[PDB]
């Protein structure tokens, strides 16, 4: 009965995807709250990749979480987290969630 | 040489998708700016349906844009717009963009 909540890092399959969208099973930083995620079966989450290109939209995860890679803030997507088999991994610190949101917000024109 | 820009309504294939994610070929409201869209080949956009479910995160498109329906603000996702074959259709008015952004921002925890 796990419902991802905002700030959770979950393992999720980003496949299926198209083109340059992130694919593959990897952590994902959940941005939407569990109340939405649980009522819809969807969530907004950003994939984490170990193939960091060092660009500013990549938000690094503190080593303490045990989740390698960077959050690709700009790659946030509406995801069916049951279909994509979300599995809880960890919880990101508030500052990572704030940085990802600020960067994604700038991308979305907020 | 079209690069989608923020506020554009484009026709796009939301397939491939998983599960409850919005699929199908339909309009999309682009939120991210062309500078990003053109450098990455990705964009953040929300799907449009001409058949509203009647929920608050739908944002109705005004008449006379030649694209009708509602923008599903909560279904925004990072999309490879070349893979999904974005075709420019129209430009949404600033108030639609702002309402979509405000709704999506609430979803994303901003």
Residue numbers in the entry:
A (entry chain B), B (entry chain A): 4 to 113
Question: What does the article say, verbatim?
Answer:
Crystal structure of full-length MazF-dr was determined at 1.3 Å resolution, which is the highest resolution currently known for MazF structures. MazF-dr crystallizes in space group P43212 with a twofold symmetric dimer molecule in the crystallographic asymmetric unit. These two protomers could be well superimposed on each other with a root mean square deviation (rmsd) of 0.121 Å over 82 pairs of Cα atoms. Each protomer of MazF-dr is composed of three α-helices and seven β-strands, which form the typical MazF/CcdB fold frequently observed in published MazF structures. Similarly, the dimeric interface of MazF-dr calculated by the PISA server occupies a total buried surface area of 1,262 Å2 (21% of the total solvent-accessible surface area), suggesting the tight dimer formation of MazF-dr. Two interlocked loops (β1–β2 loop) located at the dimeric interface between two protomers are fully ordered in the MazF-dr structure, in contrast to the high flexibility of this loop in its E. coli counterpart protein. Moreover, two catalytic residues, namely, Arg29 and Thr52 are well organized, suggesting the conserved ribonuclease activity of MazF-dr. In the absence of substrate RNA or antitoxin MazE protein, MazF-dr forms a tight homodimer in the asymmetric unit, which adopts the canonical MazF/CcdB fold observed in published MazF structures. Structural superimposition of MazF-dr with other MazF structures revealed almost identical overall dimer conformations as well as active-site configurations, indicating the conserved catalytic mechanism of MazF-dr. Thus, it appears that a large conformational change or reorientation of this loop in MazF-dr toxin protein is required for the neutralization of MazF-dr by MazE-dr antitoxin.
